[PDB]
Design a protein around this motif. Structure first.
Motif, short mmCIF file in Angstrom:
data_model
loop_
_atom_site.label_atom_id
_atom_site.label_comp_id
_atom_site.label_asym_id
_atom_site.label_seq_id
_atom_site.Cartn_x
_atom_site.Cartn_y
_atom_site.Cartn_z
N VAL A 1 -11.70 4.22 5.29
CA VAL A 1 -11.03 3.61 4.15
C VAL A 1 -11.74 2.35 3.67
N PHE A 2 -12.49 1.70 4.57
CA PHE A 2 -13.25 0.50 4.26
C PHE A 2 -14.32 0.77 3.21
N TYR A 3 -14.77 2.02 3.09
CA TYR A 3 -15.73 2.42 2.08
C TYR A 3 -15.07 3.21 0.96
N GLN A 4 -14.06 4.03 1.30
CA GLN A 4 -13.42 4.87 0.29
C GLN A 4 -12.67 4.04 -0.74
N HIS A 5 -12.00 2.97 -0.32
CA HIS A 5 -11.22 2.13 -1.22
C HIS A 5 -11.61 0.67 -1.06
N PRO A 6 -12.78 0.27 -1.57
CA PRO A 6 -13.15 -1.15 -1.50
C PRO A 6 -12.31 -2.04 -2.39
N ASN A 7 -11.71 -1.50 -3.45
CA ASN A 7 -10.79 -2.27 -4.28
C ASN A 7 -9.56 -2.70 -3.49
N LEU A 8 -9.02 -1.78 -2.68
CA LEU A 8 -7.94 -2.14 -1.77
C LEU A 8 -8.40 -3.14 -0.71
N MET A 9 -9.65 -3.02 -0.25
CA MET A 9 -10.20 -3.97 0.71
C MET A 9 -10.25 -5.37 0.12
N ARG A 10 -10.60 -5.47 -1.16
CA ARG A 10 -10.61 -6.76 -1.83
C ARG A 10 -9.20 -7.24 -2.10
N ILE B 1 0.88 -1.16 0.00
CA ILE B 1 0.00 0.00 0.00
C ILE B 1 0.92 1.21 0.00
N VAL B 2 1.24 1.70 -1.19
CA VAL B 2 2.22 2.77 -1.37
C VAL B 2 1.49 4.11 -1.34
N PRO B 3 1.72 4.95 -0.34
CA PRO B 3 1.13 6.30 -0.37
C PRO B 3 1.88 7.19 -1.35
N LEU B 4 1.18 8.22 -1.82
CA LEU B 4 1.77 9.18 -2.76
C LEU B 4 2.34 10.35 -1.98
N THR B 5 3.62 10.27 -1.65
CA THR B 5 4.32 11.24 -0.83
C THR B 5 5.55 11.78 -1.57
N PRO B 6 6.05 12.98 -1.18
CA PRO B 6 7.23 13.53 -1.89
C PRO B 6 8.45 12.63 -1.88
N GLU B 7 8.71 11.92 -0.77
CA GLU B 7 9.84 11.00 -0.81
C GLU B 7 9.49 9.72 -1.56
N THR B 8 8.20 9.42 -1.74
CA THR B 8 7.83 8.32 -2.62
C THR B 8 8.20 8.67 -4.05
N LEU C 1 1.73 -7.28 -8.64
CA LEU C 1 0.87 -6.14 -8.94
C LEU C 1 -0.58 -6.23 -8.45
N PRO C 2 -1.32 -7.37 -8.54
CA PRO C 2 -2.70 -7.38 -8.01
C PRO C 2 -2.82 -7.03 -6.54
N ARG C 3 -1.78 -7.25 -5.75
CA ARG C 3 -1.80 -6.88 -4.34
C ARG C 3 -1.24 -5.48 -4.10
N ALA C 4 -0.83 -4.78 -5.15
CA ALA C 4 -0.33 -3.43 -5.01
C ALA C 4 -1.48 -2.43 -5.10
#
Lengths: 384, 820, 375, 107
Positions: free
Chosen positions: B455-464, B88-95, B403-406
Motif C-alpha cells: 500500500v506504501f506504493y499503491q496509494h502514495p496519496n494516502l501515505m501523504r 480510511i474508509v474501505p468500499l464495502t457492502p455495509e459501507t 476531507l484532506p485526511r479522508a
C-alpha cells in the motif's frame, strides 16, 4: 579589560557605567560637553583608567586620582573644562540621539575598537577589544542609553553581596583546618549577623510572587523574577553560593564545627546551612538555564541528600532542578535512584520524595524509560 | 488497617495518594513492561472493588480510577485517539448502507436527526492489543531490544463497561437527591473519576450501540429520545466535572464528523457507478457522432482527451446553474447530487421552540448557558467550551478540514492497510519517549514492514495524507537534538529512517515536492550530520531535488550558500569522524567534501541540462571561496591539479598513510582514494554547471564570463595528464589467480569520467591537433586496456565492466560528436 | 499521452472516488456560503437570565464574549518565547472580524444609518476588551510573520473601520499606561520582514510556467500554486491599513505617538521606518521596470505583479498621508529630514517613462489607470 | 527441586501428562508471606500448554504430581524459579516461591 561586544551579552549588569562628576554638590546636573567626570563599573567597584602597561583598564577605587581616569564628552571631533553651575544646568545630551565623542581629559586619547582580530575571533563571535587610540576612526561616536532602576539596583547589590560572601569564604577557608580545641579562634570574627541578614534579604528578594495576585500582574513579577535570577547567575553569584555549602558541609555536626571555628559560630551553623539551600532554591527556581548548570554536577546534591543539617532544603533544591531541566533526567543513573529510595527508608515516609520520583519518570510530557525501569526495579518488588 | 480509616488519617492519605501518583508515573506513556508489573501490587480485584467503594476518600478514589485508566486503558486509548483524526474508509457492502439520515418519513429535505454515536461505522481503526498479565510464565528467551513489544495488561472490558454504565446511572440518581454526603466526599470527587472512565471507554469504542443510547439518556433523557429524571446537563455542577462533560460531548461531535465523512464516501461509491456508466455510454454515442456531425467534435471529445481530474470538475461544474452547458450529465443525475447537497447542509444545520431537538443545538445552548451562568475560572474549561461551541456552528468547516485526511480504498487491501496503520501507530507512539535501544529496534522493524507493505506504493496519496514523513523527520529532529554536539547517538535508526525518506521521495513528484518544503529544516540539521556515514541526511536533501526542474529552480540561494560555507569548512578543517578512528591528520576532509559536491551536482544538473540560475549562483560562491577547491588550485602557495594526483596515488599505493594503519571494516576510508576522488567530484561539478552551447552561441555576457573564468581556473594540461594516467589493470598470475586490485583503493574509471565530461562541456574539441593530442595519450591506453580485458574471464570483472560503462558514457559520445 | 490515456470509466472505483472527494469539496463546499458569524456573536454577546436578580453589588460578571476575549488576552499575556499557533484563536478572530463589516444615488441618511450600525457592530467588541486584545497579540507575536498575526491585523482592521475614535482612544490609553515597547518592536520587525518585488524570483517563476508542471494521477492544466512573488502582499496591505486606521480622523495625539513615545524608555520611529520600506519598494519597482525597459510589451504575469505592487504602494502612500495630515508638525519635520525624497524621485522617474511605455498599447489601460490614481 | 504438600487432595488417579493443557487455578505468594499473584482475583483459570516451557520450570515440574481436583502447596527454589535475574519489577532476585496450586480441571 574593556571590550566592545554585541548580542544579548551586555543586557546583563556587566555593562553598566556610572557617570560620576567631580563636583560633590549638584552632581546630578545635566551633562554639558567638555567637563571632567569619572567612569565607574558598578558590579566590580572599579573605575576606567589609563594605565601605562596595559592601556585602558579598570583600576580599584583606591587608585583613581582623576588624572588618568576622568574623561570629557565632546559633540564632535573638532579640536577645541567649563565652569560648574550652581543649579540644575542646561540640558544638552539626550538618550539615543545627539552622538557624543569621548576624549580623555589628560592624554587626549580616544576610545576605539582594536582592528586586529586573532584566530579565536576569526571563526568565533567577535569581541573587539577597546584600545584607547590616539585619534580614532570615523565611527567611534558613542550612543548613551537608559537602563532601568531595578536592574541598576540589582547591579549594585551584586558587588555588595559578592564582597560580603567572598569575605565569608575567606574566613571559612582560613580555619578550614587547624582545630581550635580549647583555644581562641584562628583570625577575625565571622560576619555571621551580616551574612544571616543578607541571606534573608535575598530569600525574600527572590521570593516567588503569590498565587493570589491578579493573573496579569503575576506574570509581570514572573518576568522580573526570571530577569533577576538571570543577572545574578550571570554575574557568578550562583557559582559563588555553591562554594559556601561546599565549605560548610565538611563538618558533620555543630560540635565538629565548633572545634574548627568556635562555639559562637556553632549555634548559627545550622541556621546558615538551612538558609543557603533556600537561597540556592530561590535562585534556580523557574529558570531552565540556571537549573541546567546542575546537569554537570548532579551527583553533588545526591551525595548530600543524607545530610541531617538540611534534608528538606536539599530535597527542595533537587525538586527545583528536576522540575525545570529535562536533560538532568537523562543524566540520572541507578546510583541516584537507589539514593533517593534510601531516603524513604532513612527519613521516613516523606511524600516529597515520591514527588521527586514522579518527576524522575516524565518531563515535558516525554517518557524516560531509562529511569522508569530503575524505579520499578529498586522500589516495587521489596514491598517494604 | 482498613483503607477507609485514611479518611481521618490525613498523614497516610497524602502519602498513599502520592504513591498512586507514582504508580501512574512509572506506567505513563505506554511503558507496558512496567504496567504489567503493576498488576501484582494492584491487581484487578482491588481496582474493581475500589471503583464501587463508596466510602473511599476523595484523592484515593480519583487515584485508583486514574490508576486503572493509566494501567489498562491509557496505552490503547492514546494510540486509538491518534487514529481518530484519519478516515480510511474501505468500499464495502455495509459501507454502502451508511446513510446521512436514518430511514424516516418526517420530511423530504431532512428527517429527524439520528442519535450520535449510534449505528455502524466502517472507518479503519486497528484493533487493540492486550495480554493477560501472568507472572508465573517463563521468562522470554529474547532479551531487551529483540523481544516483541509488550502489550497492555488485559481486563474484562465487557464487564467493565457495564460497571461504568451502572455506576454512572447510580451517580445520576444520587445527584438528583441532592444528598449531603456525596460519594468520595464531594460532587467533583463523585463525578470526575467515573466520567473519566466513561470518556476513555467511549474513545476506545468499547461501549455498544445500546450502551451509547444509555449514556445519551443520562446526559439528556428528553432530547435523545428514540421513536429525578433530569439529565447531567441540568445539575449545577462544579467547573472540574464540566471539563469532562465537554470531553464527552467532544467525542459525540467527532462521531458526527466521522458519520458525515462515511456518508460522503458511501455517496461517492453510489455516484461514481452512475457517473462512469453515463460517461461510458456517451463514449459510444461520441463514436457514432460522426454520422451527424463534423470537425467541431473537439468540443465533445475534449473530455476524453483530458485526464479525469478536470473531467469530473467539468461533470460537477453545474452548482450555480449558470454553467450547465459544459456539464453533459442528465438532469436526473444532477438532481441526485443537488439533493445530496441539500440534506448534507441540512445535516450540518445550515438552513431549512425551546426544545434543542438535536446534538448541535443542545451543545450550543448548553455551552452558552454555562458561560452566562457564572464567570468560568478554568482556562482549560474555557478553551474546551469554546472549541465545542465553534464546532457546532461551523459544521461545514469541520467537514471541510476533515476531507484532506479522508481517503477511500479498495476492500482487497484492508489486511495490509490495518498492518500499515498498526505500524504508523507504533511510530506515533514513539514520538513521546526518549532514545532507547529497545525503542530503536521498534521503528526499524516497523519501517521494514512499511517497505514490504504494498500500500506504501499503491496509494502514495494516502501515505501523504497520513503524513508519516513529518513524523519520521520529527524523529530525526529528536535523535539529532539528543547528543547534538558530542556524538549523534544510535546511528542504526538514523540510516534506516533516512533510507525511508530517500525511498519516499522517489515514489512520486508530489511526495518529493511536499518533502522539499523541509529542505532548509533538513539543511540546518545537516551541519552535525557529517558524523554519520551511509544514508546521511544530506542524501535525503539531495534526493529531495533529484530530476525535478521546478524544484531545482525554486531552490533558494542561501541554501546553496550554507552548503558552500560548510564545504569551505570541510576544505579548511579535518574530519572529526576521521580523527576518531585514528586517521592521520590532514587539513581537509575529502569524504565530506565529496558528499557536499554530490548534492551540489544534483542542485544544478537536471535531466542532462544545467540550470543556469542555480549554476551561476553556486559557481560565484566557489569563486568567492578559493579554499573550496582543495590543496591544489589554491593560488597562494598552491600546487597543480595534476601534481596533487601523483601524491594521492602515492598515498593509495604506500600503506600506513592511507589510513590509521592499526575493506577490513567494510567501510574503511581510504585517504589517498578520497583525496583522489574529491578532485573528480569537484571537476564533475564544474563540468556539469558549464554554460550550454546555445547560450555561448547566443553570446550572453554572464555565460561567456562564467565560462572564461572557469577556463582560466583549470589549465588544459592538468586535464591531459589525469586523462593520460595509466590504469592498474587486473592482470593474471600465480596459477590463474585474477589479481583484481581493491576497487576503493585503485585507479578506477570514475575519476576519469569527470575529466572527459568536463572537457566536453567546458573546453570542447576544436581542431584535429588537440583531438589527436589528447586521444593518443588519454583514451588510446583505455581502448587497448578494454581490448586486452575483453575475454571470457576478465570481462566479468568489475574493472572491465567499468571500462564498458566508461567508453560509452565518456569517450564514445565525445568521439561521435567530434567525428568530422 | 492525452489522446492515448485511460478514459474515466476504466478508473478503479476507489481511485475514482478519491479525486471525486477533492473535486466535490472544491466545487460545492468552498463555493457554499454560510453566514453564521453575526448570529453567533449575537448569542455570545447577549446576557441571558442572570440580570433579573439585580444584585446590590452589581459585580457585572462577564458575558460569554467578554470571557472569550479575556481568555485570549490571558494566553496572549502568557510569558512565552514563541507564540504558538492557535487554530481556536484563528477561527475566533476570523469570526469576530467577519461579524463586524457586513459588506446609485444612495442618500446621506441611510448611509449614516449604515455607519451607525457599523459602529454598533464594533461597539459589540471594543467595549469587551477586544481592542486591547489585538494590541497585546501584536506585541506578543514578537515580529514573527504568520497566519496568526495576519488574523490579528485583520481583526484590528475590522474593529477599526471608518476610524473609530473611541477604539483609537482606548488603544492609545492602553499603550500609554502599559508602556510596552514590544508593540512597536514587533511592528517594526514585521514591517522590515515585509517582502519587495524580486527579479530572480520572477524569472524562475516564468521558467516554471514555461515548463508547465503536471501530476501523474491525471493532470492539472496551468497550476496556480503559491506565488513566490508578493506572497505577503495581503499581509503588508493589512499592516499599513491598520497603521493608517490608527491615525485616521486626524488623531494628532496618536500621530505624535507613532513618531515618538514619551512613556517608553526606547523610541521607535515608525514614520521613518515606513519611509525605509517605501525605499525598498521603490528599488524593487525601479529594477522590475528596468527588466521591462528593453521589452516592448508587458505580459500578463508582469501586469498582475504591477497590479499588486501598485496596490501596496497605494496603501503605503495612504498611510503616509494619514501620518502627516491634521497637520502633524512632528511628522512633517521627520519626513522633511528623512529619505522620502529619493523614493519620490525614483517613482517620478519610473512614472515618466512608464506612462509613455503603456501609451503605445491599448491592452494596458487597466494597469495605467492604477498608476494614474496611485500618482 | 520442588517440595509439594497436599492440601485438599482429590482423586489421585489421573495425572496431567504430555498432550493435554493443564488448567490450574492457583495462588502465588512470596516466602515472606506477601501475596504477589493469584488467579481468583482475575476470576479466570490459568490454562497453560504442558511441555512447551512457557511456564517456569518449578511450576512445570510441580504440576505433574497433582491429580484432577487436587490442591497442593508447592515450594520452588530460585534455581527452579526466576533466580538471579528474577522477575523485573515484581519478584526480587533469589527468591523462593510458594504456590497454592489447585488443578481444578483439565481442558
Amino acid at each position: 579589560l574593556v571590550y566592545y561586544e554585541g548580542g544579548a551579552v551586555c543586557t546583563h549588569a556587566r555593562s553598566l557605567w556610572r557617570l560620576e562628576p567631580l563636583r560633590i554638590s549638584w552632581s546630578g546636573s545635566h551633562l554639558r560637553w567638555g567637563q571632567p567626570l569619572r567612569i565607574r563599573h558598578v558590579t566590580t567597584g572599579r573605575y576606567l583608567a589609563l594605565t601605562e602597561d596595559q592601556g585602558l583598564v579598570v583600576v580599584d577605587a583606591c587608585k583613581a586620582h582623576t588624572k588618568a581616569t576622568s574623561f570629557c564628552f565632546r559633540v564632535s571631533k573638532e579640536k577645541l573644562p567649563k565652569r560648574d553651575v550652581e543649579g540644575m544646568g542646561p540640558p544638552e545630551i539626550k538618550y539615543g540621539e545627539s552622538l557624543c565623542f569621548v576624549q580623555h581629559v589628560a592624554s587626549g586619547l580616544w576610545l576605539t575598537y582594536a582592528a586586529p582580530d586573532p584566530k579565536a575571533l576569526r571563526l568565533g563571535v567577535l569581541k573587539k577589544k577597546a584600545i584607547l587610540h590616539q585619534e580614532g576612526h570615523m565611527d567611534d561616536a558613542l550612543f548613551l542609553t537608559r537602563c532601568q532602576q531595578e536592574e541598576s539596583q540589582a547591579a549594585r547589590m551584586i558587588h555588595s553581596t559578592a564582597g560580603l560572601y567572598n569575605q565569608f569564604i575567606k574566613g571559612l577557608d582560613s580555619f578550614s583546618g587547624k582545630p581550635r580545641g580549647s583555644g581562641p579562634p584562628a583570625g577575625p570574627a565571622l560576619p555571621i549577623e551580616a551574612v544571616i541578614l543578607s541571606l534573608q534579604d535575598l530569600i525574600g528578594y527572590f521570593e516567588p510572587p503569590s498565587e493570589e495576585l491578579q493573573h496579569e500582574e503575576k506574570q509581570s513579577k514572573l518576568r522580573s523574577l526570571r530577569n533577576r535570577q538571570s543577572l545574578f547567575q550571570e554575574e557568578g553569584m550562583l557559582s559563588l553560593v555553591l562554594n559556601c555549602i561546599d565549605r560548610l558541609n565538611v563538618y558533620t555536626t555543630a560540635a565538629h564545627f565548633a572545634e574548627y571555628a568556635g562555639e559562637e559560630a556553632a549555634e548559627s551553623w545550622k541556621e546558615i546551612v538551612n538558609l543557603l539551600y533556600e537561597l540556592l532554591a530561590s535562585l534556580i527556581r523557574g529558570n531552565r538555564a540556571n537549573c541546567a548548570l546542575f546537569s554537570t554536577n548532579l551527583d553533588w546534591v545526591v551525595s548530600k541528600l543524607d545530610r541531617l543539617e538540611a534534608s528538606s532544603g536539599i530535597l527542595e533544591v533537587l525538586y527545583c532542578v528536576l522540575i525545570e531541566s529535562p536533560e538532568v533526567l537523562n543524566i540520572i543513573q541507578e546510583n541516584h535512584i537507589k539514593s533517593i529510595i534510601s531516603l524513604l527508608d532513612k527519613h521516613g515516609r516523606n511524600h516529597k520524595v515520591l514527588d521527586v520520583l514522579c518527576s524522575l519518570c516524565v518531563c515535558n510530557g516525554v517518557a524516560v524509560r531509562s529511569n522508569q525501569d530503575l524505579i520499578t526495579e529498586n522500589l516495587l518488588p521489596g514491598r517494604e | 488497617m482498613d483503607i477507609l480509616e485514611l479518611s481521618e488519617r490525613l498523614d497516610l492519605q497524602r502519602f498513599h495518594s502520592h504513591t498512586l501518583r507514582l504508580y501512574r508515573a512509572v506506567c505513563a506513556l505506554g511503558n507496558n513492561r512496567v504496567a504489567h508489573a503493576l498488576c501484582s501490587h494492584v491487581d484487578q480485584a482491588q481496582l474493581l472493588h475500589a471503583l464501587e467503594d463508596a466510602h473511599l476518600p476523595g484523592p484515593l478514589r480519583a487515584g485508583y480510577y486514574d490508576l486503572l485508566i493509566s494501567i489498562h486503558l491509557e496505552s490503547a486509548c492514546r494510540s486509538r485517539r491518534s487514529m481518530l483524526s484519519e478516515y480510511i474508509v474501505p468500499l464495502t457492502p455495509e459501507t454502502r448502507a451508511i446513510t446521512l439520515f436514518p430511514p424516516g418519513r418526517k420530511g423530504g429535505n431532512a428527517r429527524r436527526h439520528g442519535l450520535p454515536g449510534v449505528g455502524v461505522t466502517t472507518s479503519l481503526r486497528p484493533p487493540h492489543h492486550f495480554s493477560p498479565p501472568c507472572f508465573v510464565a517463563a521468562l522470554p528467551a529474547a532479551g531487551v531490544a529483540e523481544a516483541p513489544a509488550r502489550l497492555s495488561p488485559a481486563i474484562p472490558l465487557e464487564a467493565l463497561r457495564d460497571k461504568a454504565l451502572r455506576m454512572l446511572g447510580e451517580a445520576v440518581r444520587d445527584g438528583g437527591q441532592h444528598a449531603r454526603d456525596p460519594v468520595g466526599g464531594s460532587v467533583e470527587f463523585q463525578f470526575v473519576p467515573v466520567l473519566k472512565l466513561v470518556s476513555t471507554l467511549l474513545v476506545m469504542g468499547i461501549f455498544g450501540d445500546e450502551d451509547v443510547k444509555q449514556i445519551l439518556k443520562m446526559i439528556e433523557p428528553e432530547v435523545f429520545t428514540e421513536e429525578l429524571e433530569e439529565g447531567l446537563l441540568q445539575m449545577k455542577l462544579p467547573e472540574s466535572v464540566k471539563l469532562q462533560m465537554c470531553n464527552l460531548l467532544e467525542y459525540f461531535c467527532d462521531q458526527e464528523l466521522q458519520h458525515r465523512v462515511e456518508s460522503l464516501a458511501a455517496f461517492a461509491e453510489r455516484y461514481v457507478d452512475k457517473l462512469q456508466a453515463n460517461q461510458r455510454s456517451r463514449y459510444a454515442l461520441l463514436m457514432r457522432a460522426f454520422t451527424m456531425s463534423a470537425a467541431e467534435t473537439a468540443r465533445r471529445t475534449r473530455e476524453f482527451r483530458s485526464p479525469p481530474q478536470e473531467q469530473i470538475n467539468m461533470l460537477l461544474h453545474f452548482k450555480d446553474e449558470a454553467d450547465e452547458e459544459d456539464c453533459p450529465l442528465p438532469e436526473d443525475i444532477r438532481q441526485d447530487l443537488q439533493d445530496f447537497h441539500q440534506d448534507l447542509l441540512a445535516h450540518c444545520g445550515i438552513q431549512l421552540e425551546k426544545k434543542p431537538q438535536s446534538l448541535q443545538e443542545l451543545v450550543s445552548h448548553m455551552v452558552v448557558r454555562w458561560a452566562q451562568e457564572d464567570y468560568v475560572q478554568s482556562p482549560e474549561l474555557v478553551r474546551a467550551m469554546f472549541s465545542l461551541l465553534h464546532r457546532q456552528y461551523d459544521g461545514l468547516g469541520e467537514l471541510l478540514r476533515a476531507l484532506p485526511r479522508a481517503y477511500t480504498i479498495s476492500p482487497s487491501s484492508v489486511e495490509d492497510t490495518m498492518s500499515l496503520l498498526e505500524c504508523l501507530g507504533q511510530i506515533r507512539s514513539l514520538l513521546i519517549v526518549q532514545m532507547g535501544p529497545q525503542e530503536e529496534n521498534l521503528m526499524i522493524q516497523s519501517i521494514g514492514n512499511i517497505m514490504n507493505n504494498k500500500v506504501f506504493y499503491q496509494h502514495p496519496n494516502l501515505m501523504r495524507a497520513l503524513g508519516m514523513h513529518e513524523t519520521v523527520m520529527e524523529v530525526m529532529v529528536n535523535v539529532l537534538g539528543g547528543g547534538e554536539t558530542k556524538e549523534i547517538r544510535f546511528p542504526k535508526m538514523v540510516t534506516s529512517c533516512c533510507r525511508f525518506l530517500c525511498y519516499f521521495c522517489r515514489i512520486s513528484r508530489q511526495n518529493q515536492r511536499s518533502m522539499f518544503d523541509h529542505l532548509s529544516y533538513l539543511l540546518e540539521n545537516s551541519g552535525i550530520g557529517l558524523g554519520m556515514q551511509g544514508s546521511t541526511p544530506l542524501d535525503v536533501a539531495a534526493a529531495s531535488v533529484i530530476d525535478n526542474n521546478e524544484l531545482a529552480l525554486a531552490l533558494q540561494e542561501q541554501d546553496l550558500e550554507k552548503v558552500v560555507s560548510y564545504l569551505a569548512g570541510c576544505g579548511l578543517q579535518s574530519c572529526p569522524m576521521l580523527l576518531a578512528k585514528g586517521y592521520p591528520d590532514i587539513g581537509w576532509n575529502p569524504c565530506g567534501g565529496e558528499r557536499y559536491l554530490d548534492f551540489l551536482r544534483f542542485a544544478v544538473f537536471v535531466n542532462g541540462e544545467s540550470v543556469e540560475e542555480n549554476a551561476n549562483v553556486v559557481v560565484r560562491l566557489l569563486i568567492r571561496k578559493p579554499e573550496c577547491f582543495g590543496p591544489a588550485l589554491r593560488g597562494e602557495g598552491g600546487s597543480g591539479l595534476l601534481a596533487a594526483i601523483e601524491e594521492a596515488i602515492r598515498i593509495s599505493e604506500d600503506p600506513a598513510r592511507d589510513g590509521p594503519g592499526v575493506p577490513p571494516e567494510e567501510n574503511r576510508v581510504h585517504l589517498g582514494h578520497a583525496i583522489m576522488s574529491f578532485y573528480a567530484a569537484l571537476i564533475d561539478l564544474l563540468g556539469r554547471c558549464a554554460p550550454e552551447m546555445h547560450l555561448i552561441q547566443a553570446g550572453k555576457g554572464e555565460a561567456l564570463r562564467i565560462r572564461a573564468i572557469l577556463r582560466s581556473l583549470v589549465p588544459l594540461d592538468d586535464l591531459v595528464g589525469i586523462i593520460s594516467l595509466p590504469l592498474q589493470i587486473p592482470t593474471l598470475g600465480k596459477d590463474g589467480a585474477l589479481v583484481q586490485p581493491k576497487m576503493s583503493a585503485s585507479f578506477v574509471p570514475d575519476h576519469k569520467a569527470s575529466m572527459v565530461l568536463f572537457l566536453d562541456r567546458v573546453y570542447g574539441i576544436e581542431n584535429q591537433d588537440f583531438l589527436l593530442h589528447v586521444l593518443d595519450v588519454g583514451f588510446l591506453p583505455d581502448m587497448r586496456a578494454a581490448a586486452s580485458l575483453d575475454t571470457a574471464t576478465f570481462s566479468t570483472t568489475e574493472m572491465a565492466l567499468a571500462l564498458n560503462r566508461y567508453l560509452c558514457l565518456a569517450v564514445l559520445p565525445l568521439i561521435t560528436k567530434c567525428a568530422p | 499521452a492525452c489522446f492515448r490515456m485511460t478514459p474515466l470509466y476504466n478508473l478503479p472505483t476507489h481511485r475514482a472516488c478519491n479525486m471525486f472527494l477533492e473535486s466535490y469539496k472544491a466545487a460545492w463546499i468552498l463555493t457554499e456560503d454560510h453566514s453564521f458569524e453575526d448570529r453567533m456573536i449575537d448569542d455570545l454577546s447577549k446576557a441571558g437570565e442572570q440580570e433579573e436578580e439585580e444584585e446590590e453589588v452589581e459585580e457585572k460578571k462577564p458575558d460569554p464574549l467578554h470571557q472569550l476575549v479575556l481568555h485570549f488576552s490571558r494566553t496572549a499575556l502568557t510569558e512565552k518565547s514563541k507564540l504558538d499557533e492557535d487554530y481556536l484563536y484563528m477561527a475566533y478572530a476570523d469570526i469576530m472580524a467577519k461579524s463586524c463589516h457586513l459588506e446609485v444615488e444612495v442618500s446621506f441618511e441611510e448611509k449614516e444609518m449604515e455607519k451607525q450600525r457599523l459602529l454598533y457592530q464594533q461597539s459589540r467588541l471594543h467595549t469587551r476588551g477586544a481592542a486591547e486584545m489585538v494590541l497585546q497579540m501584536i506585541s506578543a507575536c514578537k515580529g514573527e510573520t504568520g497566519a496568526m498575526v495576519s488574523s490579528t491585523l485583520k481583526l484590528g482592521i475590522s474593529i477599526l473601520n471608518g476610524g473609530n475614535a473611541e477604539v483609537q482612544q482606548k488603544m492609545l490609553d492602553y499603550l500609554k499606561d502599559k508602556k510596552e515597547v514590544g508593540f512597536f518592536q514587533s511592528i517594526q520587525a514585521l514591517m522590515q520582514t515585509c517582502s519587495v518585488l524580486d527579479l530572480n524570483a520572477f524569472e524562475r517563476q516564468n521558467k516554471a510556467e514555461g515548463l508547465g508542471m503536471v501530476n501523474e494521477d491525471g493532470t492539472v492544466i496551468n497550476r496556480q500554486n503559491g506565488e513566490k512573488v508578493m506572497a505577503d502582499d495581503e499581509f503588508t496591505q493589512d499592516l499599513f491599513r491598520f497603521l493608517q486606521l490608527l491615525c485616521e480622523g486626524h488623531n494628532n495625539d496618536f500621530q505624535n505617538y507613532l513618531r515618538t513615545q514619551t512613556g517608553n524608555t526606547t523610541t521607535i520611529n515608525i514614520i521613518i521606518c515606513t519611509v525605509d520600506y517605501l525605499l525598498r519598494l521603490q528599488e524593487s519597482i525601479s529594477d522590475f521596470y528596468w527588466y521591462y525597459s528593453g521589452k516592448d510589451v508587458i505580459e500578463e504575469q508582469g501586469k498582475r505583479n504591477f497590479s499588486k505592487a501598485m496596490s501596496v504602494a497605494k496603501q503605503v502612500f495612504n498611510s503616509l498621508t494619514e501620518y502627516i495630515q491634521g497637520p502633524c508638525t512632528g511628522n512633517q519635520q521627520s519626513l522633511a529630514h528623512s529619505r522620502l525624497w529619493d523614493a519620490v524621485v525614483g517613482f517620478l522617474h519610473v512614472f515618466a517613462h512608464m506612462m509613455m511605455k503603456l501609451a503605445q498599447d491599448s491592452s494596458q489601460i487597466e494597469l495605467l489607470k492604477e498608476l494614474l490614481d496611485l500618482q | 527441586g520442588v517440595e509439594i504438600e497436599t492440601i485438599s487432595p482429590g482423586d489421585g488417579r489421573t495425572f496431567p501428562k504430555k498432550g493435554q493443557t493443564c488448567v490450574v487455578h492457583y495462588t502465588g505468594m512470596l516466602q515472606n508471606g506477601k501475596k504477589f499473584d493469584s488467579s481468583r482475583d482475575r476470576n479466570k483459570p490459568f490454562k497453560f500448554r504442558i511441555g512447551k516451557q512457557e511456564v517456569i520450570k518449578g511450576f512445570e515440574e510441580g504440576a505433574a504430581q497433582m491429580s484432577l481436583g487436587q490442591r497442593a502447596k508447592l515450594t520452588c527454589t530460585p534455581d527452579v524459579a526466576y533466580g538471579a535475574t528474577g522477575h523485573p519489577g515484581v519478584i526480587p532476585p533469589n527468591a523462593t516461591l510458594i504456590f497454592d496450586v489447585e488443578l481444578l480441571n483439565l481442558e
